[PDB]
Design a protein around this ligand. Structure first.
Ligand SMILES: [Cl-]
Ligand SMILES: [Cl-]
Ligand SMILES: [Cl-]
Ligand SMILES: [Cl-]
Ligand SMILES: [Cl-]
Ligand SMILES: [Cl-]
Ligand SMILES: [Cl-]
Ligand SMILES: [Cl-]
Ligand SMILES: [Cl-]
Ligand SMILES: [Cl-]
Ligand SMILES: [Cl-]
Ligand SMILES: [Cl-]
Ligand SMILES: [Cl-]
Ligand SMILES: [Cl-]
Ligand SMILES: [Cl-]
Ligand SMILES: [Cl-]
Ligand SMILES: [K+]
Ligand SMILES: [Mg+2]
Lengths: 239, 196, 230, 244, 248, 233, 234, 237
C-alpha cells in the first residue's frame, strides 16, 4: 500500500500522507480571515466540547509577533507547535536583521518548515492549516494561508476547516476592499453563524481578533463589547 | 634521583636499580623495586616522574601479557622494546605524555640477550651497557673502561659493584642498596641485593 | 535520518539482486564503445537524443577526469555525474600527495571502491552505471571498465549498453593489436553504427581520444570528418 | 520484465527487475498533478519563459500567485509541478547561486546552477529515506560567450540546455510544436521568441489568452537582468499576434 | 525504518545466520581456488574467470594478492568485496609492523580480518562480505602456513584445501593424494594441476585459464612469485604425459 | 511486526505486557512486612543435583538496611540491582545518610520504560526488563516492603508474592497476614506457603531466606538457621 | 491494521490511531477529580490497591509550592512528566526569583509532549494530568492529554467511569466559585464517589486529596489526614 | 549507526533471538567440564576430523589468563569475540586489583556481556555457552557455565552442546566422591562422559586440565589414547 509514508509517491504521483493530514484540517470547525481597507480580521467557530471548560480554553487565535496574528484549524497540538516555530522565526529575524519580519517572508519561512515534514518516513506532516495576518502603513493589510503541504498564498478572504466552501461563498458577497475592520468584524461573526451547523454541533464560542490601523498595527483580541455586539448582529441576521 | 644500570654479556643481561623512594629531603622507602616483569624473559626498569612511571610500566606490562594470552607465545625483547617506544612516542605530543626513562632487558631464544635504552622523548637505542639517572654520569666511564662484550656474569657483578661503590664514594645522594637481577635462557633470576 | 541497513543483500541462491538489476539499467542504456589502439584509446557513445531542440553541446557524456584520463558510460546519466565528480576529486587528492598524475589503474581502483560502497552501505542503491575509463601513463594506453558491483576489468576493446553482446562480437571480428588510433576511431564509430537507428551526425554521437598528448573530446567538425567515410 | 516488480521497488528508490526506478517515474506524474504547462524559448537576443496563471478562486490575492522566480538579478526561473516542492527548490537555487558568488567572485553560470540542482535531485533517487521533489525547474540567463540560455532539470536529476522546451501537462505536445517550428527556421534558431512561446502554449492548450491568464519573464543580451512583464506589456504581445 | 529493513544480522529459528549461508552459496559458484602446503613452500592455484579474448592483461594476477613481505592470498566470491578485504589486510599488516617492528605472524593477520567479518554478522544491519580467502605465508613461529577464512568470520589452518567451484570434489582428491610431511613444491604443483584438471569440467585445462603463485624462502627472505605462462603450460604438459604413463 | 514503543488498542505497551508475562516464568518469591522487620523468601528452583545451590542468588543485599528478591529473567535483574547499589552509595556520599527504601525503589523504577530505537545512544536498551523485584528494608519509616514490575510501577505492600505461583501464594498471604504479626510468624508463614506452591519438596538447600530488622543489618539465613526454621513446618 | 502502529502514520480519515490508543491508557486509570473556587484549587483521587495487602498507588504529586498534579495512565510517564514540570518550575525561580505561571507551565507541557507524536519510532506520553495551581491570576485547574492538547477547566474528571464525575461537576459547577474550602473538597469527593460501584465507598485507604490556594502551599492529604474531609459527607 | 531493536519480547514472555541463540549452542560440539578436588578438567568433541586440518588452529579450549580457562559450544566466531573480551578484562583486573581474577569475577563479566547483547540496539545475542574453570587465590577449584541469555551458575560437573542432555544424565549418576578422588579418575570421568556421545570412539576428543597453581596443560593424542585403553579394558568385567 502506497499511503503509509510521506517519502512514498503513489503510482499517480500523490503523497497520500499529506492528503490525510489535510483531512484532519477538513474535519475541524471553521476559521476565517478577511483583509479589508485598513487591516485583517480573524474569526473562529470554537466548538465547546464540554461545559466544564473555561471560556477561552483551546484558543485558535495566537499572537506570533506584535504585528502578526495566526488563526488555525486542525490538530491543535500541531498548530501550537507551528505558532512556536512562527514566533521563533520572527524573533530570530529581528535579532539578525534588526527590524520586524515582513509578513510575506514570515509566511514563506514557516511554509518551508511545514514543507520539510512532507518528504520523509522519519516524520509526519502537520495536521493543520493556518492563516497569518498583519497590517503596517508601509505594507498595508496582508493575509496569508499555509496548508499541510507547505503551500503559501496571499488572500482577500480565506476559510479553513469543514465549512470552508460555504464560508467562501459568503465572504465573496462582501466588497471587503472598501470596508473597515470595524465593519468587517460584524461580517465575520455573521458568516461564522451562517456556516455553523447548530443541529450537529450544539455549542460554540466565537473567537475574534484583528490587526489594523485601529490597533496601530498590533495584533489584538477584539474587545469584549465589540465581539458581543458582533454576535448580536450575527444572531439577529440569522432571523 | 633514581639509578638504573644494565650490562649485557654474551648470553645474559644484568640489571640493577636503586631501592630508594625519596621525597624532598627524606628517603620514604629503602626497599623500593624499579623493575617490572613483562614476561618470562623480559624486565622493564622504569624511572621518572611520580605516577607516570608506574602507570606507564604497568600499562606496558598488561599489554605484553595480553599479547601472550591472545597468541599463545611471547613478544620478543626487540618487539616489546618497539611496542614500548611506539606508545611513548605516540603520547609525546598528546594531552597525556609520560615523563619516564627506561631500560628494557631481555633474552630471546634465537637472538640472545638484548638491552635497550629509552629516554622520555622515546628515542630507542640498543646498547651493550647503559645507565639512567644522575648516577650514570659517574658510572658510564667505569663501564667504558672495564667492559668487554664477552664479560662473564661473575666478572659483570664485580663491574656492577665498582659502579655502585663509585656512587657511595662520589655521588651526593644516599643510595645505600640496590636490586640486582639477571636474565638468561632460563628466565629471570633474583640475585642478592648489593648493600652498603 | 538515513537508513542504516543495507538495501542490497544476498538471495538464497547467493545473488546480489540489486546489483543484477543495476546491470539491467546499464544494459538498457545507450551504447558506448572503447578501443585500445597501439598508440591511444578511443571512447565513443551514442546520444539517446530525441529532438532538434536539445543543445547537444550543453552536457557531455565523454568527460575529462585529468589532463590524461577520460571516461564515458552506459546507464543512468545522473548517477554518472556523481562518479565523474568523485573521480575528479580522487585524482586531485592523489596529485596533492604524490605530485604525479594518478595512474589510470589507480584511479579506476579508487572509483571502483566507491561503487562497491553503494552495494553495502546503509540506505542506498547501487549505481546504475558502468564506466569506461581511458588513460595514458608509463608510455602506454589503458582501457578499463568498472561495473555497478565495483568490479573492474582491463579491455583491449569492448561495448556496453544496448546490443553490447553483438558489439563485442563485432569488435572481436575487427580488432587487432597493431591498429593505430585513427583506424580505431573509425572502427569504434562502425561499432555504434551496428545498433544505431536514425542516421548518424556529429551532433548525436560523442567521441573522446586519449594518447601521449592527453585526453580530449573530439570536436563536432572532427567527428563530421570521420563520419563522411561512414 | 515488461512492468515487473519485486520487494519494495514501488515504494522506495531501489531498482526494479528491469532496472527502473518507479518512485522516480511517479515523481514525474506528480509534476502533472497541478494541471499547468510552461514553455521556454531562446533566440540570439533573448530567452523567455511563459507559464499559465490559473486563479480560479476570486478571493486569492492574484499578485501572490506566480510560478516565476528571480534566482539572482540575472537568472530567472519557471517552476512546474508541486508548489511547495517547487518553492523549496527555488530557495535552494538562490542559496547555491549566492554561495557561488561569495566563494568564486563571479556570478554562477546558468548551466552550472542547473547542474547543481540536478545533482542535488540525483541524491533523492539513490537514498531511500526521502522522496524526489515532484517539480521541474526551467532556468533562463545570458551567458557572456554563448548568449541566451534555457536549461531544464527534472526529478530524475537529468538536465540539459535547449533551443526551446516545455514542462507539465502538455510537455509532449509543446515539444512537437516547437520541433516542427525550428526545422523551418534558418540555422535552426528561433527568432520571434516571445511570440513563439505564447503561440506554442495557446495552441497546445487551445485557449487564446487574456493577459491575466499567463505570466512572462525575459532576459536579453542588451538587458541581462531578469524581468517579469506586466499585464499591459503582455497585452501588447497578445494584440500584435491577434492582428496577422 | 522497520518496514524496509531486511535484518541481515539476526538469528533464524534454528540458530542460523541466513545472510552468511547465502554468501557461502555465492562463493560455491565462484572460480575454483586451492592452496597446498609443502615442506619448502606454499602455493595457491586459481581458476581465472577473466578469459574473454578482448581482455587486456595489465596486472600480474587476477585473484592473487600480495599482503606484505611474507604473505599472499587468493579469493573466491564477490570481487569488489575481496578488494575491500585485501586492502584491509594490508593495513592491518602495516599497523602491526609499525608497532612491533616485525612482520605480523600469519595467524594474527587472519584472525584480525576474521574479527571484522564476524562483526558484520552480529551488528550494523549490513550485508556480509561475499568472500572466502586462502592465505599463504611464512613466519618465524610456525614457518610455512595455509589458512582459509569464510564469511562467518571463521578460519582454519590446512595443509591443503579448496574453495569455490567444485571444492568438495577437489578436497576428496587432495585427501587421497596429499602426502602429509612429504610434499615439495614440485609435487604440490603436480597435484594442483591434477586437481584443477578434474574440477574444471568447463573444458580441457589451459594455461590462460589458471593462475599459480608460489611462496618460498631463499637466503633468509620470503619470495612470492606468480608463475609465467610458459611454466604453467609445462606443468600441464607434464601432467598429460603422466596420465599417459598411468595405465602401463 | 511493529515497533517496541507501540501502544495496543487498550492503551498498553505491548513490550511491557509481554515482559509482565515473562515474570510468570520465574520462581516464586515472597515478602512480608512486620513491625519487627521484613522477610524475603524465594524458591531456588534447582534443575540438576550437579548445580551448586549456593550459586543461585535470588535474594541480594542492596545495602545494610535493604535487601531485594527477584523473579523472572534473572540475568536482566543484574543491571537493576547494580543501579540500586550505586544509587544508595551515591546518596550516602552526597548526604551522609541512608537512602529510604521508597527512594531506592523509585530510582530503579525510573529505568523502566527507557527503551526504544530512534532517539537514544548507539546501543541503548532495546526492550524492557523481564523482572519483578521485592525491595525489603528498614529506614526511619520503620520496616518496609516495596514491589516493582516492568512497567515501572512501584508500591508498598504488607505482603506480596511474585513469580509463577504468585496467584496461589498471594491468596494464602491474605489468609495469614495481620498487622501485629511477629517476624518469626511471618518467616514461618512464608516457608509454609513456599512449601505448598513449590513443585519440589522444600528443604534447607532449595530455598533462600533473608531478613532486615530495626536491630540488625540484612541477614541471609545460613543452612543451619534454615534447618532450624524448617523443623516446625 | 496498516494505520495503527506508528504515531507518524495518518489514517485516511485524518486520525492518528497511536494517539487514540495512548488516550485509552488514561481512560483505564483510576478516576481523579479537579475543581476550583475563587481562592483554592483541589485535586481528589481514587487510589487502586492491586491486592488487599498492597498500600494503594500514589496519585497526587508535588510540583512546586504553588502547583500539584493528579495522574491517570502510565505511572512511569507520569513521573517523567512530573520531573520535567518540577525542573521548569525550579528554573523559573532560579532565573526570575518568582513562581512559574501555571498557564505557562501547561504550554511547556503541550510543546514537550507534542514532539514524540510527530517522529518515527517515538510514542505519545500515555498519561493524562489534572494540574492544580495558584498564581497572580488565581486558582487553576488544567487538564493535559496524550494528544498534547490541554484544557483550562472550571473542573474536570479523567479515568475510569469519570463520565459520572463529570456529570456531577456540571450539575454543581455554578456553586464552586463562591464555596469555602471545606465545601469545595466535599464537592470533589461527591463527584469522585459517583465513579464507584454501588456497594463501595470512599475510605481513608482509597482517597487522596491535594489542595493549593491563596494562603496555602500545595499540600497532599492521605490516610488518617483525609478523615476530617470524609466526615460530615453523608 | 544501526539502532534497530533486535531482541524483543513476544507474546507469553519469550525472547526469540535468545532462544535461537540457544539453538545455535545445541548444534555445537559437545563440551564437558568436571570440577575435581584439586584439579578441573575440560573435554570437548572435535569438529569433523579432516586429515588435512592443522589441529592447533581449531582448539575449543582457551586460556583467559594463567589461572582461568574456558571451553565453549556454539558459533566459533562469536566465541573468539567473547574470549578476547574476557582476556582484556583479566588484564584490567590485574591492573586495578593486583590480584588475578576469581573464576567467578570473570564468569560474571562474561555473563553480563552476553546479557547486554540481548538488550542493546543493533546487535544480536552471542550464539555460545561457556564452561569456565580454574582456581581461586585460596586454592578452591571452580566450574561455571554461562549461556546466551547471560545467566550463569556454578556446577560440580556439566555438559553443553549437542547431546548435553544425555551427558548430563551420565554425570548425575557418575559424579561421586569416588569418581573424583584422584586426578586420573577425574580425567577418566570426563572421557567416559564424552564417549557416551562421541561418534568415532575418540579419536576426535580434545582434553585439557588445570591444577592448583600449575596453568593449562593440554593432553596430546598419545596421552588421550592411554586413558581410553585404560578405561575400555576396565569396562570388560
Ligand atoms: Cl481546510
Ligand atoms: Cl535505520
Ligand atoms: Cl565535476
Ligand atoms: Cl592531474
Ligand atoms: Cl575535453
Ligand atoms: Cl557575494
Ligand atoms: Cl521564430
Ligand atoms: Cl611488508
Ligand atoms: Cl611486514
Ligand atoms: Cl508475579
Ligand atoms: Cl492510573
Ligand atoms: Cl503503569
Ligand atoms: Cl485531545
Ligand atoms: Cl478519561
Ligand atoms: Cl559491551
Ligand atoms: Cl547446551
Ligand atoms: K528516495
Ligand atoms: Mg603529566
Amino acid at each position: 500500500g502506497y499511503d503509509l509514508s510521506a517519502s512514498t509517491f503513489s503510482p499517480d504521483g500523490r503523497v497520500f500522507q499529506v492528503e490525510y493530514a489535510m483531512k484532519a484540517v477538513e474535519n475541524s470547525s471553521t476559521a476565517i480571515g478577511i483583509r479589508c481597507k485598513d487591516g485583517v480580521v480573524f474569526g473562529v467557530e470554537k466548538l465547546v466540547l464540554s461545559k466544564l471548560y473555561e471560556e477561552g480554553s483551546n484558543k485558535r487565535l495566537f499572537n506570533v509577533d506584535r504585528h502578526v496574528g495566526m488563526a488555525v484549524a486542525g490538530l491543535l497540538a500541531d498548530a501550537r507547535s507551528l505558532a512556536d516555530i512562527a514566533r521563533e522565526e520572527a524573533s530570530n529575524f529581528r535579532s539578525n536583521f534588526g527590524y520586524n519580519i515582513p509578513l510575506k517572508h514570515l509566511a514563506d519561512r514557516v511554509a518551508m518548515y511545514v514543507h520539510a515534514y512532507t518528504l520523509y518516513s522519519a516524520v509526519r506532516p502537520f495536521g493543520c492549516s493556518f492563516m497569518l495576518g498583519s497590517y503596517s502603513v508601509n505594507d498595508g493589510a496582508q493575509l496569508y494561508m499555509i496548508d499541510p503541504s507547505g503551500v503559501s498564498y496571499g488572500y482577500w478572504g480565506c476559510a479553513i476547516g469543514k465549512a470552508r466552501q460555504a464560508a467562501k461563498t459568503e465572504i465573496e458577497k462582501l466588497q471587503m476592499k472598501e470596508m473597515t475592520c470595524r465593519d468587517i468584524v460584524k461580517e465575520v461573526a455573521k458568516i461564522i453563524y451562517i456556516v455553523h451547523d447548530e443541529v450537529k454541533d450544539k455549542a460554540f464560542e466565537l473567537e475574534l481578533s484583528w490587526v489594523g490601523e485601529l490597533t496601530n498595527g498590533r495584533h489584538e483580541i477584539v474587545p469584549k463589547d465589540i465581539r458581543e455586539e458582533a454576535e448580536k448582529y450575527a444572531k439577529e441576521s440569522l432571523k | 634521583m633514581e639509578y638504573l644500570i644494565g650490562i649485557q654479556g654474551p648470553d645474559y643481561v644484568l640489571v640493577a636499580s636503586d631501592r630508594v623512594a625519596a621525597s624532598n629531603i627524606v628517603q620514604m622507602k629503602d626497599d623500593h623495586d624499579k623493575m617490572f616483569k613483562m614476561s618470562e624473559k623480559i624486565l622493564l626498569l622504569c624511572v621518572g616522574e611520580a605516577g607516570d612511571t608506574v602507570q606507564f610500566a604497568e600499562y606496558i606490562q598488561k599489554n605484553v601479557q595480553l599479547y601472550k594470552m591472545r597468541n599463545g607465545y611471547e613478544l620478543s625483547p626487540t618487539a616489546a622494546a618497539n611496542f614500548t617506544r611506539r606508545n611513548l612516542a605516540d603520547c609525546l605530543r598528546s594531552r597525556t605524555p609520560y615523563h619516564v626513562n627506561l631500560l628494557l632487558a631481555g633474552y630471546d631464544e634465537h637472538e640472545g640477550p638484548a638491552l635497550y635504552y629509552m629516554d622520555y622523548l622515546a628515542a630507542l637505542a640498543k646498547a651493550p651497557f647503559a645507565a639512567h639517572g644522575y648516577g650514570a654520569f659517574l658510572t658510564l666511564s667505569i663501564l667504558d673502561r672495564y667492559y668487554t662484550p664477552t664479560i662473564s656474569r661473575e666478572r659483570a657483578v664485580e663491574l656492577l659493584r665498582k659502579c655502585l661503590e663509585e656512587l657511595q664514594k662520589r655521588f651526593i645522594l644516599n643510595l645505600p642498596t640496590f636490586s640486582v637481577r639477571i636474565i638468561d635462557k632460563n628466565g629471570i633470576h633474583d640475585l642478592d641485593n648489593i648493600s652498603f | 535520518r538515513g537508513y542504516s541497513f543495507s538495501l542490497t543483500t544476498f538471495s538464497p541462491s547467493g545473488k546480489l539482486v540489486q546489483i543484477e538489476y543495476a546491470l539491467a539499467a546499464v544494459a538498457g542504456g545507450a551504447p558506448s564503445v572503447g578501443i585500445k589502439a597501439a598508440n591511444g584509446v578511443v571512447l565513443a557513445t551514442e546520444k539517446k537524443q530525441k529532438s532538434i531542440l536539445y543543445d547537444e553541446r550543453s552536457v557531455h557524456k565523454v568527460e575529462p577526469i585529468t589532463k590524461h584520463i577520460g571516461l564515458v558510460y552506459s546507464g543512468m546519466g545522473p548517477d554518472y555525474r556523481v562518479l565523474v565528480h568523485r573521480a575528479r576529486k580522487l585524482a586531485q587528492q592523489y596529485y596533492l600527495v604524490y605530485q604525479e598524475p594518478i595512474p589510470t589503474a589507480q584511479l579506476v581502483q579508487r572509483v571502483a571502491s566507491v561503487m562497491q560502497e553503494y552495494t553495502q552501505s546503509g540506505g542506498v542503491r547501487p549505481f546504475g552505471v558502468s564506466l569506461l575509463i581511458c588513460g595514458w601513463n608509463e608510455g602506454r594506453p589503458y582501457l578499463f571498465q568498472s561495473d555497478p558491483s565495483g568490479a573492474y576489468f582491463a579491455w583491449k576493446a569492448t561495448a556496453m549498453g544496448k546490443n553490447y553482446v553483438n558489439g563485442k562480437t563485432f569488435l572481436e571480428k575487427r580488432y587487432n593489436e597493431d591498429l593505430e588510433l585513427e583506424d580505431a576511431i573509425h572502427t569504434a564509430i562502425l561499432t555504434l553504427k551496428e545498433s544505431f537507428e536514425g542516421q548518424m551526425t556529429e551532433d548525436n554521437i560523442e567521441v573522446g581520444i586519449c594518447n601521449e598528448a592527453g585526453f580530449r573530446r573530439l570536436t563536432p567538425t572532427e567527428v563530421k570528418d570521420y563520419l563522411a567515410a561512414i | 520484465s515488461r512492468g515487473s516488480s519485486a520487494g519494495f521497488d514501488r515504494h522506495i528508490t531501489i531498482f526494479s527487475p528491469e532496472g527502473r526506478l518507479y518512485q522516480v517515474e511517479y515523481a514525474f506524474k506528480a509534476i502533472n498533478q497541478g494541471g499547468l504547462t510552461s514553455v521556454a524559448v531562446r533566440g540570439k537576443d533573448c530567452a523567455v519563459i511563459v507559464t499559465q496563471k490559473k486563479v480560479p478562486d476570486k478571493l486569492l490575492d492574484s499578485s501572490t500567485v506566480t510560478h516565476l522566480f528571480k534566482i539572482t538579478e540575472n537568472i530567472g526561473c519557471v517552476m512546474t509541478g508541486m508548489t511547495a516542492d517547487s518553492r523549496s527548490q527555488v530557495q535552494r537555487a538562490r542559496y547555491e547561486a549566492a554561495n557561488w558568488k561569495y566563494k568564486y567572485g563571479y556570478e554562477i553560470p546558468v548551466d552550472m546552477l542547473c547542474k547543481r540542482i540536478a545533482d542535488i535531485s540525483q541524491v533523492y533517487t539513490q537514498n531511500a529515506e526521502m522522496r524526489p521533489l515532484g517539480c521541474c525547474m526551467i532556468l533562463i540567463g545570458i551567458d557572456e560567450e554563448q548568449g541566451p540560455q534555457v536549461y531544464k532539470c527534472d526529478p530524475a536529476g537529468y538536465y540539459c540546455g535547449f533551443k526551446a522546451t516545455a514542462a507539465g501537462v502538455k510537455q509532449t505536445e509543446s515539444t512537437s510544436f516547437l520541433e516542427k517550428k525550428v526545422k523551418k527556421k534558418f540555422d535552426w534558431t528561433f527568432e520571434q521568441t516571445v511570440e513563439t512561446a505564447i503561440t506554442c502554449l495557446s495552441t497546445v492548450l487551445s485557449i487564446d489568452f487574456k493577459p491575466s491568464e499567463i505570466e512572462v519573464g525575459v532576459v536579453t543580451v542588451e538587458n541581462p537582468k531578469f524581468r517579469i512583464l506586466t499585464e499591459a506589456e503582455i497585452d501588447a504581445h497578445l494584440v500584435a499576434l491577434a492582428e496577422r | 525504518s522497520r518496514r524496509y529493513d531486511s535484518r541481515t544480522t539476526i538469528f533464524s529459528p534454528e540458530g542460523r545466520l541466513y545472510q552468511v549461508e547465502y554468501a557461502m552459496e555465492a562463493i560455491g559458484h565462484a572460480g575454483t581456488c586451492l592452496g597446498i602446503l609443502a615442506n619448502d613452500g606454499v602455493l595457491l592455484a586459481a581458476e581465472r574467470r577473466n578469459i574473454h579474448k578482448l581482455l587486456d592483461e595489465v596486472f600480474f594476477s587476477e585473484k592473487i594478492y600480495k599482503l606484505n613481505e611474507d604473505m599472499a592470498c587468493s579469493v573466491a566470491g564477490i570481487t569488489s568485496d575481496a578488494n575491500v578485504l585485501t586492502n584491509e589486510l594490508r593495513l592491518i599488516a602495516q599497523r602491526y609492523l609499525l608497532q612491533y617492528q616485525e612482520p605480523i605472524p600469519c595467524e594474527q593477520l587472519v584472525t584480525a580480518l576474521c574479527d571484522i567479518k564476524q562483526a558484520y554478522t552480529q551488528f550494523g544491519g549490513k550485508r556480509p562480505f561475499g568472500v572466502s580467502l586462502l592465505y599463504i605465508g611464512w613466519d618465524k613461529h610456525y614457518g610455512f602456513q595455509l589458512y582459509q577464512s569464510d564469511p562467518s568470520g571463521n578460519y582454519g589452518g590446512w595443509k591443503a584445501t579448496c574453495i569455490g567451484n567444485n571444492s568438495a570434489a577437489a578436497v576428496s582428491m587432495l585427501k587421497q593424494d596429499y602426502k602429509e610431511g612429504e610434499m615439495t613444491l614440485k609435487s604440490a604443483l603436480a597435484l594442483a594441476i591434477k586437481v584443477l584438471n578434474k574440477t574444471m569440467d568447463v573444458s580441457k585445462l589451459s594455461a590462460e585459464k589458471v593462475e599459480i603463485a608460489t611462496l618460498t624462502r631463499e637466503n633468509g627472505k620470503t619470495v612470492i612469485r606468480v608463475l609465467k605462462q610458459k611454466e604453467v603450460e609445462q606443468l600441464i604438459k607434464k601432467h598429460e604425459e603422466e596420465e599417459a604413463k598411468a595405465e602401463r | 511486526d511493529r515497533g517496541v514503543n507501540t501502544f495496543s488498542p487498550e492503551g498498553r505497551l505491548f513490550q511491557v505486557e509481554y515482559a509482565i508475562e515473562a515474570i510468570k516464568l520465574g520462581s516464586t518469591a515472597i515478602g512480608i512486612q512486620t513491625s519487627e522487620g521484613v522477610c524475603l523468601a524465594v524458591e531456588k528452583r534447582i534443575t540438576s543435583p550437579l548445580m551448586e545451590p549456593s550459586s543461585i542468588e535470588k535474594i541480594v543485599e542492596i545495602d545494610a538496611h535493604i535487601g531485594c528478591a527477584m523473579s523472572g529473567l534473572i540475568a536482566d535483574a543484574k543491571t537493576l540491582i547494580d543501579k540500586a547499589r550505586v544509587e544508595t552509595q551515591n546518596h550516602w556520599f552526597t548526604y551522609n545518610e541512608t537512602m529510604t527504601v521508597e527512594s531506592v525503589t523509585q530510582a530503579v523504577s525510573n529505568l523502566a520504560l527507557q527503551f526504544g530505537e530512534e532517539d537514544a545512544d548507539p546501543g541503548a536498551m532495546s526492550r524492557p526488563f523481564g523482572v519483578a523485584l521485592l525491595f525489603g528494608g528498614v529506614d526511619e519509616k520503620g520496616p518496609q516492603l516495596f514491589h516493582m514490575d516492568p512497567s515501572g510501577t512501584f508500591v508498598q505492600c504488607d505482603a506480596r508474592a511474585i513469580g509463577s505461583a504468585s496467584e496461589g501464594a498471594q491468596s494464602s498471604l491474605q489468609e495469614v497476614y495481620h498487622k501485629s504479626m511477629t517476624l518469626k510468624e511471618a518467616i514461618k508463614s512464608s516457608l509454609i506457603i513456599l512449601k505448598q506452591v513449590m513443585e519440589e519438596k522444600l528443604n534447607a538447600t532449595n530455598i533462600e531466606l533473608a531478613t532486615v530488622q530495626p536491630g540488625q543489618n540484612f541477614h541471609m539465613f545460613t543452612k543451619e538457621e534454615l534447618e532450624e526454621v524448617i523443623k516446625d513446618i | 491494521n496498516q494505520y495503527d502502529n506508528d504515531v507518524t502514520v495518518w489514517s485516511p480519515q485524518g486520525r492518528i490511531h497511536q494517539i487514540e490508543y495512548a488516550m485509552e491508557a488514561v481512560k483505564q486509570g483510576s478516576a481523579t477529580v479537579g475543581l476550583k473556587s475563587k481562592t483554592h484549587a483541589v485535586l481528589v483521587a481514587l487510589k487502586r490497591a492491586q491486592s488487599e495487602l498492597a498500600a494503594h498507588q500514589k496519585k497526587i504529586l508535588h510540583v512546586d509550592n504553588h502547583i500539584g498534579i493528579s495522574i491517570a495512565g502510565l505511572t512511569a510517564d507520569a513521573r517523567l512528566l512530573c520531573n520535567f514540570m518540577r525542573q521548569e518550575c525550579l528554573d523559573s525561580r532560579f532565573v526570575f526569583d518568582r513562581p512559574l505561571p501555571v498557564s505557562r507551565l501547561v504550554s511547556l507541557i503541550g510543546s514537550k509532549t507534542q514532539i514524540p507524536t510527530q517522529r518515527y519510532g517515538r510514542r505519545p506520553y500515555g498519561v493524562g494530568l489534572l494540574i492544580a495551581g495558584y498564581d497572580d491570576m488565581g486558582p487553576h485547574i488544567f487538564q493535559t492529554c496524550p494528544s498534547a492538547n490541554y484544557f483550562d477547566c472550571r473542573a474536570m474528571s479523567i479515568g475510569a467511569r469519570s463520565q459520572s464525575a463529570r456529570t456531577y461537576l456540571e450539575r454543581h459547577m455554578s456553586e464552586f466559585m463562591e464555596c469555602n474550602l471545606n465545601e469545595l473538597v466535599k464537592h470533589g469527593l461527591r463527584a469522585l464517589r459517583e465513579t464507584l460501584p454501588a456497594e463501595q465507598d470512599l475510605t481513608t485507604k482509597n482517597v487522596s486529596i491535594g489542595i493549593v490556594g491563596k494562603d496555602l502551599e500545595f499540600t497532599i492529604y492521605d490516610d488518617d489526614d483525609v478523615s476530617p474531609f470524609l466526615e460530615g459527607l453523608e | 549507526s544501526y539502532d534497530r531493536a533486535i531482541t524483543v519480547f513476544s507474546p507469553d514472555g519469550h525472547l526469540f533471538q535468545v532462544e535461537y541463540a540457544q539453538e545455535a549452542v545445541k548444534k555445537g560440539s559437545t563440551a564437558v567440564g568436571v570440577r575435581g578436588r584439586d584439579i578441573v578438567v575440560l573435554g570437548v568433541e572435535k569438529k569433523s576430523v579432516a586429515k588435512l586440518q592443522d589441529e592447533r588452529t581449531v582448539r575449543k579450549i582457551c586460556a583467559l589468563d594463567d589461572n582461568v580457562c574456558m571451553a565453549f559450544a556454539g558459533l566459533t566466531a562469536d566465541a573468539r569475540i567473547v574470549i578476547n573480551r574476557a582476556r582484556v578484562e583479566c588484564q584490567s583486573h590485574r591492573l586495578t586489583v593486583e590480584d588475578p581474577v576469581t573464576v567467578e569475577y570473570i564468569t560474571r563479566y562474561i555473563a553480563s556481556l552476553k546479557q547486554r547483547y540481548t538488550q542493546s540496539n543493533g546487535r544480536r545475542p552471542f550464539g555460545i555457552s561457556a564452561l569456565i574453570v580454574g582456581f581461586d587465590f585460596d586454592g578452591t577449584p571452580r566450574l561455571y557455565q554461562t549461556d546466551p541469555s547471560g545467566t550463569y551458575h556454578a556446577w560440580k560437573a556439566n555438559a553443553i552442546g549437542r547431546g548435553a542432555k544425555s551427558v548430563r544424565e551420565f554425570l548425575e549418576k557418575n559424579y561421586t566422591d569416588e569418581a573424583i578422588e584422584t586426578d586420573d579418575l577425574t580425567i577418566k570421568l570426563v572421557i567416559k562422559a564424552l564417549l557416551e556421545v562421541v561418534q568415532s570412539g575418540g579419536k576426535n576428543i580434545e582434553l585439557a586440565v588445570m591444577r592448583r597453581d600449575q596453568s593449562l596443560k593440554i593432553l596430546n593424542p598419545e596421552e588421550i589414547e592411554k586413558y581410553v585403553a585404560e578405561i575400555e579394558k576396565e569396562k570388560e568385567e
